[PDB]
């Protein structure tokens, strides 16, 4: 009888690595979509187009505008909520959206507790390692009415990790 520690990915950014555990047991579709886009190089070259100190940093848009991106299936998909998955700590990873069931590819990472998002945005991950990298991202000189970082900071490429207990 073996154990499966599940899948996780490491975001290789211009300012460091961020390792994210992906809750594939709870949010299956969100999990497969994230892993698939990650493997297709979809996020390679993506910048964090909106960084709000104390709130969250958002990315996942190839176009870099703020209204781009889509799912591996090429069509927005349903939300996946769980009463045990909440924006209660610094480092939760969730899917941005424009209302119920409009999940595509954009996602964000919280800089702290953000209870008003619970049950409104699908949380599918958590930063397990590389918290340092999050601090660098937060204290980044940004615009002021757009929060667009002054200097572009990208996600160079992504490493997918398999079951740690294989």
């Amino acid at each position: 009888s073996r154990v499966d520690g599940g899948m996780s990915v490491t975001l290789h950014t211009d300012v460091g690595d961020i390792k994210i555990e992906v809750f594939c047991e709870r949010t299956p579709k969100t999990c497969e979509n994230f892993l698939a886009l990650c493997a297709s190089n979809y996020y390679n070259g993506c910048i964090f187009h909106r960084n709000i100190k104390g709130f969250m940093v958002q990315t996942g848009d190839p176009t870099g505008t703020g209204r781009g991106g889509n799912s591996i299936w090429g069509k927005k998909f349903e939300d996946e909520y769980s009463e045990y998955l909440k924006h209660n700590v610094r480092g939760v990873v969730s899917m941005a959206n424009n209302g119920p069931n409009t999940n595509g590819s954009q996602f964000f990472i919280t800089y702290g507790k953000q209870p008003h998002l619970d049950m409104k945005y699908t949380v599918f991950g958590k930063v397990i390692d590389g918290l340092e990298t999050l601090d660098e991202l937060e204290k980044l000189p940004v615009n002021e009415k757009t929060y667009r970082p002054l200097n572009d900071v990208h996600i160079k490429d992504i490493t997918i990790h398999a079951n740690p207990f294989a």
Binding site: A96, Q106, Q114
Partner: peptide
């Protein structure tokens, strides 16, 4: 306010 949308950014 503090929302995470994709396109129409609101307050």
């Amino acid at each position: 306010x503090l929302l995470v949308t994709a396109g129409l950014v609101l307050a």
